[PDB]
Amino acid sequence: SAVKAARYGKDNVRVYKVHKDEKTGVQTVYEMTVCVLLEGEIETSYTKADNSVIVATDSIKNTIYITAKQNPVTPPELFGSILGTHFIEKYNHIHAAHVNIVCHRWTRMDIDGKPHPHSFIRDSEEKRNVQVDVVEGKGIDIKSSLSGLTVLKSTNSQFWGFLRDEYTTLKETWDRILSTDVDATWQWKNFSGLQEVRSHVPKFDATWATAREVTLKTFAEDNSASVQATMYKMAEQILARQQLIETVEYSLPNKHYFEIDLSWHKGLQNTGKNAEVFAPQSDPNGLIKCTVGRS
Amino acid sequence: SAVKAARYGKDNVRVYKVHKDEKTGVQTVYEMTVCVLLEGEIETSYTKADNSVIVATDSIKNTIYITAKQNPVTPPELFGSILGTHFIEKYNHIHAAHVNIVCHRWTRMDIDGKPHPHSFIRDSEEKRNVQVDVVEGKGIDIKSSLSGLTVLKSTNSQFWGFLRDEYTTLKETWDRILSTDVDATWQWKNFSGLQEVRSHVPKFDATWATAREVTLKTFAEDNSASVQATMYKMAEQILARQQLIETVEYSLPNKHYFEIDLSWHKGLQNTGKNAEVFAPQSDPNGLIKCTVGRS
Amino acid sequence: SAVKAARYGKDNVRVYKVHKDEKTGVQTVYEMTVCVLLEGEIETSYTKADNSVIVATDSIKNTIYITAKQNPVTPPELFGSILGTHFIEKYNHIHAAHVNIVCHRWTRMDIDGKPHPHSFIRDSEEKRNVQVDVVEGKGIDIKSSLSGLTVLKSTNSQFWGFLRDEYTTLKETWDRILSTDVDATWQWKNFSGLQEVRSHVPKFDATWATAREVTLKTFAEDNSASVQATMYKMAEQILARQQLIETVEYSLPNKHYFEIDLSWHKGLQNTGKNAEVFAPQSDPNGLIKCTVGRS
Amino acid sequence: SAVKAARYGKDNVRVYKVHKDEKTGVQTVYEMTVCVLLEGEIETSYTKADNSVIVATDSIKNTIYITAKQNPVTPPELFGSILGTHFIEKYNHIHAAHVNIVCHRWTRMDIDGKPHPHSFIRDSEEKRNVQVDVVEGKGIDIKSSLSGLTVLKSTNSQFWGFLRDEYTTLKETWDRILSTDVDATWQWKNFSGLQEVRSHVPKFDATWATAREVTLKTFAEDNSASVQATMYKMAEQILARQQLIETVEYSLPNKHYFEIDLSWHKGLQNTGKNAEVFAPQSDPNGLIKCTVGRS
Numbered sequence A, B, C, D: 001s002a003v004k005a006a007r008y009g010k011d012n013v014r015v016y017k018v019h020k021d022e023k024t025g026v027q028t029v030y031e032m033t034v035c036v037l038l039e040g041e042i043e044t045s046y047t048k049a050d051n052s053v054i055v056a057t058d059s060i061k062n063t064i065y066i067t068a069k070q071n072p073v074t075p076p077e078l079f080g081s082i083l084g085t086h087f088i089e090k091y092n093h094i095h096a097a098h099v100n101i102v103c104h105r106w107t108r109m110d111i112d113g114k115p116h117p118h119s120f121i122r123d124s125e126e127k128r129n130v131q132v133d134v135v136e137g138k139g140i141d142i143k144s145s146l147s148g149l150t151v152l153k154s155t156n157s158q159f160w161g162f163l164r165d166e167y168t169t170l171k172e173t174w175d176r177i178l179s180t181d182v183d184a185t186w187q188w189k190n191f192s193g194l195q196e197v198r199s200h201v202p203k204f205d206a207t208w209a210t211a212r213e214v215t216l217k218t219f220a221e222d223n224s225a226s227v228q229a230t231m232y233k234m235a236e237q238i239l240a241r242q243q244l245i246e247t248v249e250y251s252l253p254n255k256h257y258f259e260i261d262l263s264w265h266k267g268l269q270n271t272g273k274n275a276e277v278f279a280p281q282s283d284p285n286g287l288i289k290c291t292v293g294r295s
């Protein structure tokens, strides 16, 4: 036997950081969940019980807290780059660091129409994420994403003209509910290292904003011919508004809402144009994916 | 053996309803999860296989959809009352209906600063709930609640002066993080029946609003001496703003954020006034409960 | 305002304990999740910020570990009694302790047909639980339970003869799938205190065994007329095999498996006697409950 | 913009199938959750709203049930191959099918020491899975796995000799708890098509058995120097017992159990050799991965 691949590290590391403006008195909080997997010349840990090559995952944990203490944790793309760079620079035998981060929402509360200085709300379960790969000699590869963005439109969704054979029972429709949980990823041009990532720091928050904004507007205004069509239009626009993005990926479940025929009951009309009460279906669900790049 | 108690019904019934303004073109959506448990002279179903006394849970399901089709589903207190009343009025041998409803958020999207006519967002996992007990001869008992309201304040929380004995290691603190998931319940004066519930319909939405508003403001502004102290102040206020409420219940986890001593690392100062990076603790958690009524 | 009720404590306290037989070399492990809520003269903590009446939940946590260190953790009914008794005996102003415990499975592994001395498997997510209420002057009330016991039978289940009206669409059936997650609770005669609980210690494990055994056999052999009928028969038997039990409670979801009509496809016959492939339904589900006592 | 990649299908399709031995009267049940994603010439669905290229996910759902009706669903490797082959053979423009299957446990119950003919138990949440890729012109690639196999050993685990620097606080240990959730994958030699998969059908169940057996025995008997060392030994053995396997992948969380220093309490000794009560840590956790192939 031979080790073909190996990676190890710490997962599910919860981290909070507060910023306190000594002057204004305004505090700002950040919470994330961090995962770090390292690769390098560590194969002997697996084959001969050579733990000398192992940076203890406990130590990786410590390093996450220490890096958060010594550096900004925002934008996450930057923090992840700093953290990954640490490991490959610090340990000679460590040649790759993968850093995955989930950013949790702590939105500042408005009390009596006024933003509160130190009170926050988890206004949604929607996350902002980053996946950062720091590879010795190959720079820094960064994928940014939003996920758990749950939406529904009650009309202006359609699905007709799909293939029909002996396996097909679905009726064509020109008016349906469309609901999904948006998972959108934008993949950045390779960065040569931390300097290049730092030089672009403003664009991360700005591109996240754009991705969210375009997603919501496109979803809301597109008289959708299908999930496929609608999601391409989102990816289209995002690519046109940020040149440093190479690809845009969408993964969208179709969270079906079924009509309920109640005509059996006192001639109740609840289908078609009379459709009012629907049965949300927990499973199964359509799953539609696409990666859009530049022509 | 003898049956001491029995109840049966349908749980986890997902229901969507749309309202379409034919004139304005504005659509409004409602989604909930409904549970209905019936009691009455049904003991023979258990002891002698007498299914004649059973209103099939499948039929209860049907009835939920039909009631939603024929009546407003908002406010949930009303819908639940209508649904529970149906069962005890329709079936002679059914003497109690318990209706539990979870209301899911579908907040109308704002696109380009403008409210969209048919696109919505699950802006949080926070729920609005009702528990409605319709009992033959005893009227309608209603408990209303909000839950899954997740908050954090970064300062203006304290905990000192608690009992100290040989079991105590916790240090007193005059400055800590306080985070919780708010579960607040307001219990209504008994209602004689559906007429009385309908006569008060405006107060349900208004009292939910108040409960949420008071919860957030109290949390944000109280320089909390403890979870106990802070939650009583919330319950205090709500009781003073709606006379038809008899009690207010709070159940609040204390979602601990631990300081991290990094002094072992290059004399790093991250405790006390220098505390910046914290370890959110998933478990265990303090759990604090209280029911406040009128003196 | 006035406090009508109050309770506070620590929830989600994970605890592991190992027993090591110095002689045989056999180790035995126990894992549980503990929750402890206290009541007493603590109202001033809520109304006047008087923390002197508060036994810190952090301290309750400590006490859980210390009690586990100083006492057997099995059977859980005993451990919970010991723990609850501690709090009301130790603190003069604490008049009630509620202890909830979830026992997690660590079944000893059999390797090469031989029980291993220190290796275990979580052989199922099924739990054994206790709810123990230690009340000053009122003794010790104990409810024992098993939960998350997931079962299915593929035939020998029926449901016909239920009420039919204009709300009814379910077809009668003489052959269906029955699947559920068993939640069974047996409630013990009041105990005067710890001595009485200790005197009965063997009966706890024995009664849990019996409850499980009777549940599975009854489920498997009863040509069930309904969930109601079948569950009463379980409760019947358990009450007859342990006199110290006063009531038996069952809460059983009916986890529906729907037939799939495939006759639209090449005359495929998959209904009735030809039913082979079914659609498991995640929701909604029937929910059937009963408490059986002694005539 | 241009589509770089696209795939679509149905996820979370629950399927049950029963086998009824007309002679013996013995019934056997199978339950799984199926996911199917298709690739091919479907890009126009995304770019021009051309739904003619779309096999409706609703239809994919239908096809899953129909294939289960017409073919054995066991072993899952075979069923998945049959299902994937269907799609690329049936639809000219569909060039790849990915089929993911989760197999749920329904273990036959033993009643009074006797296997019951139609009653089953979900004896664990452990799953058996397959990932099957059917690619036109490139045959059938199959990855088989077991997951959710939760284990613990109370001793015979060690971790010393790891790197120590200014980031390191973990103490070396020669006696610790090791607990994990086993995710083991064995990747099969490419198959030319369905005939070749069918010719090997016995080896699938046999290789799953072996993988599980070797995992448990190695875990139980290895006086582990680390997770890394122990998992390689598992992968080593599996590769030596089934030549048609090319690689073996393990992904193992280290589910930490922390000692609890109780010496602050009445000199209580609960560390080192006196360690009895531990604090299971829900998060964070070490994560250790490796792919082992043939030298």
Ligand SMILES: O=c1[nH]c(=O)c2[nH]c(=O)[nH]c2[nH]1
Pocket (backbone or CB within 6 Å): A159, A170, A225, A226, A227, A228, A254, A286, A288, D008, D054, D055, D056, D057, D058, D059
């Ligand atoms: O937008 C959709 N895309 C599909 O691929 C599909 N398949 C299906 O059944 N409904 C839908 N809807």
Ligand SMILES: O=c1[nH]c(=O)c2[nH]c(=O)[nH]c2[nH]1
Pocket (backbone or CB within 6 Å): B159, B170, B225, B226, B227, B228, B254, B286, B288, C008, C054, C055, C056, C057, C058, C059
């Ligand atoms: O507000 C608090 N209340 C408590 O009862 C308690 N117990 C504890 O350890 N910390 C806290 N904090």
Ligand SMILES: O=c1[nH]c(=O)c2[nH]c(=O)[nH]c2[nH]1
Pocket (backbone or CB within 6 Å): B008, B054, B055, B056, B057, B058, B059, C159, C170, C225, C226, C227, C228, C254, C286, C288
């Ligand atoms: O055993 C059953 N009990 C019910 O009360 C019921 N209701 C229903 O629709 N199916 C069933 N099955």
Ligand SMILES: O=c1[nH]c(=O)c2[nH]c(=O)[nH]c2[nH]1
Pocket (backbone or CB within 6 Å): A008, A054, A055, A056, A057, A058, A059, D159, D170, D225, D226, D227, D228, D254, D286, D288
């Ligand atoms: O088996 C282990 N491997 C590691 O890589 C590691 N890291 C750590 O902190 N503890 C352990 N244990």
Ligand SMILES: [C-]#N
Pocket (backbone or CB within 6 Å): A227, A254, A285, A286, A287, A288, D057, D058
């Ligand atoms: C399916 N969309």
Ligand SMILES: [C-]#N
Pocket (backbone or CB within 6 Å): B227, B254, B285, B286, B287, B288, C057, C058
């Ligand atoms: C704990 N509060």
Ligand SMILES: [C-]#N
Pocket (backbone or CB within 6 Å): B057, B058, C227, C254, C285, C286, C287, C288
């Ligand atoms: C429904 N039982």
Ligand SMILES: [C-]#N
Pocket (backbone or CB within 6 Å): A057, A058, D227, D254, D285, D286, D287, D288
């Ligand atoms: C960490 N193992």
Ligand code: NA
Pocket (backbone or CB within 6 Å): A087, A088, A089, A090, A091, A092, A093, A094, A095, A136
């Ligand atoms: Na390096």
Ligand code: NA
Pocket (backbone or CB within 6 Å): B087, B088, B089, B090, B091, B092, B093, B094, B095, B136
């Ligand atoms: Na009645």
Ligand code: NA
Pocket (backbone or CB within 6 Å): C087, C088, C089, C090, C091, C092, C093, C094, C095, C136
């Ligand atoms: Na007392």
Ligand code: NA
Pocket (backbone or CB within 6 Å): D087, D088, D089, D090, D091, D092, D093, D094, D095, D136
């Ligand atoms: Na093809």
